[PDB]
Design a protein around this ligand. Structure first.
Ligand SMILES: *C(=O)[C@H](CCSC)NC=O
Lengths: 271, 46
RNA sequence: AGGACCGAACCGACUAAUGUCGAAAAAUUAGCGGAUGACUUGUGGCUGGGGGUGAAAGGCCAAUCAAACCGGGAGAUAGCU
RNA sequence: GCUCGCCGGAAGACCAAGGGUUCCUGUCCAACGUUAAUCGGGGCAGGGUGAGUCGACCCCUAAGGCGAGGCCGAAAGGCGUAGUCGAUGGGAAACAGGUUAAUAUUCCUGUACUUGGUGUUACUGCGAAGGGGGGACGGAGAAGGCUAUGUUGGCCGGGCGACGGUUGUCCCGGUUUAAGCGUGUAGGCUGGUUUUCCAGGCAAAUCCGGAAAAUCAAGGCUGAGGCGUGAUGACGAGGCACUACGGUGCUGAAGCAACAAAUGCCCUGCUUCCAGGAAAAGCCUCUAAGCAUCAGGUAACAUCAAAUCGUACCCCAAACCGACACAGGUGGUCAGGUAGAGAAUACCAAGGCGCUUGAGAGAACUCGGGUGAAGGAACUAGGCAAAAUGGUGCCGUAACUUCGGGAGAAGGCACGCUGAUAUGUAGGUGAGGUCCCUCGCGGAUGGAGCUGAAAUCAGUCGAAGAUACCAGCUGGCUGCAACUGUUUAUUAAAAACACAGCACUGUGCAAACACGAAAGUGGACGUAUACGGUGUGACGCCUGCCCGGUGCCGGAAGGUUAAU
RNA sequence: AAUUCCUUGUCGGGUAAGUUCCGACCUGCACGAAUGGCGUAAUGAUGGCCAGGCUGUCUCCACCCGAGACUCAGUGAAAUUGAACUCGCUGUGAAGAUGCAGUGUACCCGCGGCAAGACGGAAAGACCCCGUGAACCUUUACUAUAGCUUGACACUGAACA
RNA sequence: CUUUAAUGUUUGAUGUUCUAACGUUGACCCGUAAUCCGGGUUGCGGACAGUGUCUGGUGGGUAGUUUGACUGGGGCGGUC
RNA sequence: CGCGGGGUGGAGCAGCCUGGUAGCUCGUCGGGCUCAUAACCCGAAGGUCGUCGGUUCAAAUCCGGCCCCCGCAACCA
């Protein structure tokens, strides 16, 4: 929820947290935990490929189901756990046969509901079925690109895709960004919007928060020396050189989109 | 003041040991230079 | 609870004096700041030369950096001494 | 040998790391030592470093290295799969006492424990490169219960005193004892037992997971410390026998209690918060291919084995790193008494040193300090430096404010000792005995003893009672920056950077971008409430007009236009 | 005003006295809205300023305490250095004389201090200038260029409209 | 001659459809106790994409260099 | 105090570059419309080209001096 904090100390003033008394207070389900080694933006070649990344509280990758292959087997949600990898929340589902497995948590579903998948499966939040068996207009999250690929669209705390057109062997979706793209019909997705929409209002407060969050300080270009950033230079705030990235690449308006292998799928550019 | 050289047998070895040198083309090349000049403390190990 | 307060260990380096062919190629003496954190530290890895790293000074990379060290071009060139 | 002074959260005692014989004995004093030198970390000769249990080696993994094939690349070579290395982590096992010129948890004595080979024997379904459990885990907080250790008392032994008193409720010292085994407590976790079935766990499963029955109530797991035992053994103050007079041979009393109490242990707990907190094997359990006469497995007992390397000394320094016997730097552990909140600080303990030039003289001048008449910033770039303030408790405390502050605002007052209150209080710990008992380390009660705040009252001492060390200077106007923080190692710490927050813009996943001839990685095991780039830099009010020029994006008629 | 040259602008406050400080005046040489504007509690080893306290900073220093400085003993350096029988003065001089001319003055040598000179020691001046020197950095200087992007051919086909 | 006609002829321009090259950082299987790689089935794509030679443009991201002399010191000015 | 540019009816600006020919808006004057003014309409006047001096057939113009006005410079030790 949108909980406010008290200004006892500086830095503690502006803090506002999304604190929920629904999330399981205990440790996670052991058979679904793997270590995830962090590297501060460093590739195999040793260098730093992406800036700003480093530090951060240690994590453990919770394995999640995306493809949700198992179908026709009713399952009940045991509990709602917290995962420091997604902005969403994960639910520790319990299949009828005993195969415990994690899934992304949809909208206000709670620990105890029964959800299933398949093609027989009914139209209810958390349920999964191919979209060609789903009505035009309804909104769906956790959308799959290719049959069997897994589900790669709108799965970040609140995002949700809306089905738009019945194009024969194709279906068309309005993506959260606004862009509208034809995806293959036979793919599968899960009804309802991703929960934790309130994640919008999480305000960190003190700079420190971002540090353990995992991000490092950002240094503006015009403070660097010319020899480092294209902006650089100046006897104190001199400028006027068409803002670019630290690679001379034009920023603040520059279409970099160039695939050509996928123009066939994208109907109308993002709005 | 913390003067530069900090002693470490282990670090010194993996970095400049015989097997460390013998590992790569350049290292093998380096040794060949020492051999002809007739140096005695060829590598530094033990 | 707190990048919360006073304050040793610990880390830091504002001021003053001594030193300035030193006790010492940056310390001592008296005061000083932080001191549960963006903290500090041992051990071991990883990144490398127009390249690395950088809470960015053009600071640092073995007392050496607006382009390191060593060997080699190479007895470079020098209308100057 | 005798006094004296200094450290004592060390200037002490153990280790790593690193040194590499500096250890110890005899012996020499040319050179080394900032002086002499008989001395020495100096030369020379010799001696010294004993391990099934400490550590390494070894089993097993993290970051990361290497990498059969393989993908890729002018060669060289790059990355990476199966694997195989890699501790700073996990995994079996010893404690006490004595002994040397130097070694000891290694040697001797007593007393144990651990992992395997083989065999005898009573028995029994065993079995993986496989499945499951286990290993296996964050920050902060709060006490509860203990021990180290200490204080006091009792006891034992010794003394009665260089100058007044001192058989006394008087003075000095000791008052010690492990691991292991038994015992299973304070306290913590979790409800157990049997039967049937199962689309789950790449196969299989009696194991785990799930679903129902029925059934029983407590079972089981974990776990400090205490009490026995180890131990009618050792240590043991000081005598007794001899002194090579350095020490040695023998001998040997008391050996208990109460309380205070840790940052150590229970606790690789409980509560709680968010930032959501390794891996693998050992170990336990269960099956597959296979083997059933066996083989193997479990338990008792006997026998045998535990290899190899390190082990001396230094280790906050004269031996490491700084060119030196250098005021410097160097991770972890143990850390006593009085006073004190305290690991500050002062004086002391054990233990260790007086810093490897000295002896005088007592001038200016310099350095470190003490004090100063009256005035009290007139000094000066500037109150630079000094002085000054300083503690506990209680009363009391503004403007402005984001309502938390400001605030310890400011400013004051009271603090020693002695007795009484009260032949020591409140409070804490708590034996005897009695009652009970599901019987032991038990449940209540009961209160001796012991320890011991804070306060009031009266008297008294001095100039001064937070007397020493230790220990805020305060207030008002104002610029800049929100704020803790970061930064020019070695003249600049700031108004510079960062920062949460805001805006713009890019990016629909084989993402944009980035490293890279390439493969492949990072981004992200994320997917627009996401990620990158840029610019301002909390919060409050708010953010105007200009598309001429530059740049960016959208457009397509015509002109112009490459290779062909 | 961290911005105002003229300027110590003008008025007022604070002062015996105020080129700084504080509040206003607009005459903004040459502020101004996200290279943000105006405020703002709290914080600051921050800049400026005022008052109180407090004092050797000072008026204007005095005494004492210690470590050197000084003497005796041992050990024992360093920068520097053409040669020296190495005075003042007026002038002269490559234009600032211990050394030249004239004149004055001065017995030979040590010790403890003081720094005016010996254009004193130290570093082939970093400021200035020069060289058809070098080095990095800049852009709508030049010429190329990785990358991005456009088209044609090959990889690369087949049928209809 | 102007620009008209129907049939073949030499090709072009796009638009649709198909698949057999090629892509596949989609599914399952085998090598194989293997998230690498290759092979094989099936799906999605599909002559586009992507790559090589040639070529226009962009291109201080990057590199090599130029940027005069006299001058009552140098710059600015003026000048050759 | 050097360098660049300008000065034109009562006001602000054109034309100056290449010498002959000076224009635009406002302002003024007279008439009309209105009860009167503004507004609006009609018609007309008004210039020494900063001043003096040159070259030329002739100078606002092209050259020079002086005056004024605006802007920039007036730095490095
Ligand atoms: C000029 O300012 C120059 C500066 C010398 S800094 C050593 N002055 C010369 O006298």
């Amino acid at each position: 929820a949108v909980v406010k904090c008290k200004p006892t100390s500086p830095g503690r003033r502006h803090v506002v947290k999304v604190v929920n008394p629904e999330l399981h207070k205990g440790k996670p389900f052991a058979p679904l935990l793997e270590k995830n080694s962090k590297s501060g933006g460093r590739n195999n070649n040793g260098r730093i490929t992406t800036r700003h990344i480093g530090g951060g509280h240690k994590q453990a990758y919770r394995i999640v189901d995306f493809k949700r292959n198992k179908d026709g087997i009713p399952a009940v949600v045991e509990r709602l756990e917290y995962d420091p990898n997604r902005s969403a929340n994960i639910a520790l589902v319990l299949y009828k046969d005993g195969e415990r497995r994690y899934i992304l948590a949809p909208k206000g579903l709670k620990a105890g509901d029964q959800i299933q998948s398949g093609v027989d499966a009914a139209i209810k939040p958390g349920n999964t079925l191919p979209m060609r068996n789903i009505p035009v207009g309804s909104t769906v999250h956790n959308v799959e690109m290719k049959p069997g690929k897994g589900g790669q669209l709108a799965r970040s705390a609140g995002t949700y895709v809306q089905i738009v057109a019945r194009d024969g062997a194709y279906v068309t979706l309005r993506l959260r960004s606004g862009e509208m793209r034809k995806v293959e019909a036979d793919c599968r997705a899960t009804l309802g919007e991703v929960g934790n929409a309130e994640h919008m209002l999480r305000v960190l407060g003190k700079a420190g928060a971002a540090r353990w969050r995992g991000v490092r300080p950002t240094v503006r270009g015009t403070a660097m020396n010319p020899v480092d950033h294209p902006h650089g230079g100046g006897e104190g705030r001199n400028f006027g050189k068409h803002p670019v990235t630290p690679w001379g690449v034009q920023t603040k308006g520059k279409k970099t989109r160039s695939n050509k292998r996928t123009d066939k799928f994208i109907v109308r550019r993002r709005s | 003041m913390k003067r530069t050289f900090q002693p470490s047998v282990l670090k010194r070895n993996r970095s400049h040991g015989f097997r460390a040198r013998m590992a790569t083309k350049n290292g093998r090349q380096v040794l060949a230079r020492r051999r002809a000049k007739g140096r005695a403390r060829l590598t530094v190990s033990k």
